[PDB]
Design an enzyme around this catalytic site. Structure first.
Site, PDB file in Angstrom:
ATOM      1  N   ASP A 143       0.869  -1.187   0.000  1.00 16.07           N
ATOM      2  CA  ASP A 143       0.000   0.000   0.000  1.00 16.07           C
ATOM      3  C   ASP A 143       0.923   1.262   0.000  1.00 16.07           C
ATOM      4  OD1 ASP A 143      -2.467   1.458   0.039  1.00 16.07           O
ATOM      5  OD2 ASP A 143      -2.414   1.691   2.169  1.00 16.07           O
ATOM      6  N   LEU A 144       0.360   2.411  -0.338  1.00 13.76           N
ATOM      7  CA  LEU A 144       1.118   3.662  -0.326  1.00 13.76           C
ATOM      8  C   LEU A 144       0.978   4.334   1.038  1.00 13.76           C
ATOM      9  CD1 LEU A 144       2.753   5.617  -2.251  1.00 13.76           C
ATOM     10  CD2 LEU A 144       0.580   6.743  -2.738  1.00 13.76           C
ATOM     11  N   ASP A 145      -0.224   4.808   1.346  1.00 16.67           N
ATOM     12  CA  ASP A 145      -0.428   5.573   2.579  1.00 16.67           C
ATOM     13  C   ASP A 145      -0.277   4.703   3.846  1.00 16.67           C
ATOM     14  OD1 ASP A 145      -2.281   7.034   4.716  1.00 16.67           O
ATOM     15  OD2 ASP A 145      -1.585   8.503   3.271  1.00 16.67           O
ATOM     16  N   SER A 189      -2.553   0.272  -4.008  1.00 14.81           N
ATOM     17  CA  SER A 189      -3.078   1.450  -3.339  1.00 14.81           C
ATOM     18  C   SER A 189      -4.361   1.916  -4.015  1.00 14.81           C
ATOM     19  CB  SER A 189      -2.064   2.570  -3.424  1.00 14.81           C
ATOM     20  OG  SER A 189      -2.542   3.764  -2.834  1.00 14.81           O
ATOM     21  N   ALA A 190      -5.327   2.321  -3.187  1.00 16.17           N
ATOM     22  CA  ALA A 190      -6.504   2.997  -3.664  1.00 16.17           C
ATOM     23  C   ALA A 190      -6.226   4.424  -4.167  1.00 16.17           C
ATOM     24  CB  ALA A 190      -7.570   3.020  -2.579  1.00 16.17           C
ATOM     25  N   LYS A 248      -9.425  10.401   9.124  1.00 19.66           N
ATOM     26  CA  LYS A 248      -8.280   9.613   8.655  1.00 19.66           C
ATOM     27  C   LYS A 248      -8.724   8.247   8.110  1.00 19.66           C
ATOM     28  CE  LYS A 248      -4.139  11.571  10.677  1.00 19.66           C
ATOM     29  NZ  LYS A 248      -3.450  11.952  11.927  1.00 19.66           N
ATOM     30  N   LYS A 282     -10.612  -2.313  -0.626  1.00 18.10           N
ATOM     31  CA  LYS A 282     -10.244  -2.929   0.657  1.00 18.10           C
ATOM     32  C   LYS A 282     -11.398  -2.779   1.666  1.00 18.10           C
ATOM     33  CE  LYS A 282      -5.559  -1.471  -0.341  1.00 18.10           C
ATOM     34  NZ  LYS A 282      -4.344  -0.699   0.071  1.00 18.10           N
ATOM     35  N   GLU A 305       0.888  -3.433   4.976  1.00 23.37           N
ATOM     36  CA  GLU A 305      -0.248  -2.523   5.215  1.00 23.37           C
ATOM     37  C   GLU A 305      -0.263  -2.047   6.659  1.00 23.37           C
ATOM     38  OE1 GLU A 305      -2.510  -0.611   4.381  1.00 23.37           O
ATOM     39  OE2 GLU A 305      -3.807  -1.345   2.743  1.00 23.37           O
ATOM     40  N   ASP A 306      -0.932  -0.915   6.846  1.00 25.47           N
ATOM     41  CA  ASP A 306      -1.118  -0.282   8.123  1.00 25.47           C
ATOM     42  C   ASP A 306      -2.587  -0.234   8.589  1.00 25.47           C
ATOM     43  OD1 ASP A 306      -2.037   1.703   6.293  1.00 25.47           O
ATOM     44  OD2 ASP A 306      -1.508   3.261   7.732  1.00 25.47           O
ATOM     45  N   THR A 355       0.049  11.470   3.254  1.00 26.63           N
ATOM     46  CA  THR A 355      -0.232  12.842   2.873  1.00 26.63           C
ATOM     47  C   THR A 355      -1.264  13.408   3.859  1.00 26.63           C
ATOM     48  OG1 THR A 355      -1.734  11.947   1.176  1.00 26.63           O
ATOM     49  CG2 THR A 355       0.490  12.695   0.470  1.00 26.63           C
TER      50      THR A 355
HETATM   51 MG   LIG Z   1      -2.316   1.846   4.202  1.00 24.57          MG
END
Ligand SMILES: [Mg+2]
EC number: 5.4.2.6
Length: 218
Positions: free
Chosen positions: A8-10, A114-115, A45, A145, A169-170, A16
């Site tokens: 995933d990105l975020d 990533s979404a 968030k 997701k 993932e987070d 961001t």
């Molecule tokens: Mg994530």
């Protein structure tokens, strides 16, 4: 040994969050809604744009048409996109760049799952595009997701089955999505959000090739 890592990105590569926060604040200020402060922003968030907008409208019991809703959502996004113009290599989370290098030198495939509709842009701003074998296009997947679709697409895009892959993932919904894809999750954060049943690291500096190999073996 695993053949791919699906990122995933975020919350893994970067975030961001300050830019999203400034965007929503700016929008609230424009339309005269009090309350959109850092503490309130915690409730936005990882929430969708439309749900985040409605939470803000609710602070003032404010009622709006479909077209007005569309435009306020557009306005926040325009805000956000302008602000992310400043994303740079310094935004890369601790350990990730070294992980990417090590994966690539060991011929392990690297895919984005990533979404984010700004994934490729963000990867370019952080100078990480040359490490990525593929980016799963979130516009081309049926379900988000915790559906596994995006992780399946990512693994397939690099020529592997998800069962050959580690997913990083987070979020709980991300970790679920990885699980149901058939890839192996390793979470970053705390078990109270992510679950007790998967391996978790406290931060991304713990994501090393050595460590992902130990998890895979175990
Ligand atoms: Mg994530």
């Amino acid at each position: 040994m695993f053949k791919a890592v699906l990122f995933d990105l975020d919350g893994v590569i970067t975030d961001t969050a300050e830019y999203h926060f400034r965007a929503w604040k700016a929008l609230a200020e424009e339309i005269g809604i009090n309350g959109v402060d850092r503490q309130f922003n915690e409730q936005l968030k990882g929430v969708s744009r439309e749900d985040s907008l409605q939470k803000i409208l609710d602070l003032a019991d404010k009622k709006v048409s479909a077209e007005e809703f569309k435009e306020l959502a557009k306005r926040k996004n325009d805000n956000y996109v302008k602000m992310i113009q400043d994303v740079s290599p310094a935004d890369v989370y601790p350990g990730i760049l070294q992980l990417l290098k090590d994966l690539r030198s060991n011929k392990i495939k690297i895919a984005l799952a990533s979404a984010s509709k700004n994934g490729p842009f963000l990867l370019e701003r952080m100078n990480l595009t040359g490490y990525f074998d593929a980016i799963a296009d979130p516009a081309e997947v049926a379900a988000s997701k915790p559906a596994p679709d995006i992780f399946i697409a990512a693994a397939h895009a690099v020529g592997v089955a998800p069962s050959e892959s580690i997913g990083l993932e987070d979020s709980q919904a991300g970790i679920q999505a990885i699980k149901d894809s058939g890839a192996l999750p390793i979470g970053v954060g705390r078990p109270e959000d992510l679950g007790d049943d998967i391996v978790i690291v406290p931060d991304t500096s713990h994501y090393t090739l050595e460590f992902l190999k130990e998890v895979w073996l175990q």
